[PDB]
Curated annotation (Swiss-Prot):
The active site is at residues 39, 69, 224. GO terms for cellular component: extracellular region. Its EC number is 3.4.21.64. The gene is PROK. One of its GO terms (biological process) is proteolysis. It is an enzyme of class 3 (hydrolase). It catalyses: Hydrolysis of keratin, and of other proteins with subtilisin-like specificity. Hydrolyzes peptide amides. Belongs to the peptidase S8 family. This is Proteinase K. Binds 2 calcium ions per subunit. Residues 7-279 form the Peptidase S8 domain. Transmembrane segments: none annotated. GO terms for molecular function: metal ion binding; serine-type endopeptidase activity. It comes from Parengyodontium album.
Length: 279
């Protein structure tokens, strides 16, 4: 399949080269997979989600995305126009309030929620969690992300936007999950992207167009926006049978575009997510 005039990040994940604008992907498109978007919620009624998005959990008075960040991430995972995996199911877990903040105990509970809730969903092709969130180092948050991964969910988490080593951030510093840095359309490390030996992969993170609340769209930047590309890519690859939840991050790093990013600090992987689709 070919999506002409796609967002640059979708076109990048299906290209050996920057600077193209067509997204190529197998038409299975993550059908039969599931992605939990653990964030500020999802505007499930956005026409871009086509009935495939639903709120499954909130820790606040409403499940409704009052921020836009969770909607934007869910759109990069699986919306028809802005999404990597255009047929996946999206499950919203609102662990962040509408200023995008969340206590870490709520974030931990939401992660444990997903590890159990996936047994209430039909995801024959496998389960992904996208965690476009983070703060300071927490061994309890790392361990929650590790449990989720251990439970058979691919966990993809943002490296953080501190332009620092991600060792000092959670859940970015949890080694068993897939820690995602951000690159820009010129294959530069995004100026804000964390780095370090705990990063597993880079995805498009600068000026990423996706769904926004109020049925709108907008372009925003962040390792938080790189993560759903990788989450979406995992759901897509799992549906194609190329990998499983336990091995997707490794598989994505094995099949990634290698050595194409600039300003990657010594000791950080130079790997850009790539679906390796041959049309």
């Amino acid at each position: 399949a070919a999506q002409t005039n796609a967002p640059w990040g979708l076109a990048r994940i299906s290209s050996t080269s920057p600077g193209t604008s067509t997204y190529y992907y197998d038409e299975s498109a993550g059908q039969g997979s599931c992605v939990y978007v653990i964030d500020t919620g999802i505007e499930a009624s956005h026409p871009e989600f086509e009935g495939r998005a639903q709120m499954v959990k909130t820790y606040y008075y409403s499940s409704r995305d009052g921020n836009g960040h969770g909607t934007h991430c869910a759109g990069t995972v699986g919306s028809r126009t802005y999404g990597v995996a255009k047929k996946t199911q999206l499950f919203g877990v609102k662990v962040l309030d509408d200023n995008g903040s969340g206590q870490y105990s709520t974030i931990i509970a939401g992660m444990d929620f997903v590890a159990s809730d996936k047994n209430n969903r039909n995801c024959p092709k496998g389960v992904v969690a996208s965690l476009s969130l983070g703060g300071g180092y927490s061994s309890s948050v790392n361990s929650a992300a590790a449990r989720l991964q251990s439970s058979g969910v691919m966990v993809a988490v943002a490296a953080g936007n501190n332009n620092a080593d991600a060792r000092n951030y959670s859940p970015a510093s949890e080694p068993s999950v897939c820690t995602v840095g951000a690159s820009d359309r010129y294959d530069r490390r995004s100026s804000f992207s964390n780095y370090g030996s705990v990063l597993d992969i880079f995805g498009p993170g600068t000026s990423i167009l996706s769904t926004w609340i109020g049925g709108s769209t907008r372009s925003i930047s962040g390792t938080s926006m790189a993560t759903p590309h990788v989450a979406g890519l995992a759901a897509y690859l799992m549906t194609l049978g190329k990998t499983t939840a336990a091995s997707a991050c490794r598989y994505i790093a094995d099949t990634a575009n290698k050595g194409d990013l600039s300003n990657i600090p010594f000791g950080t992987v130079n790997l850009l997510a790539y679906n390796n689709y041959q049309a």
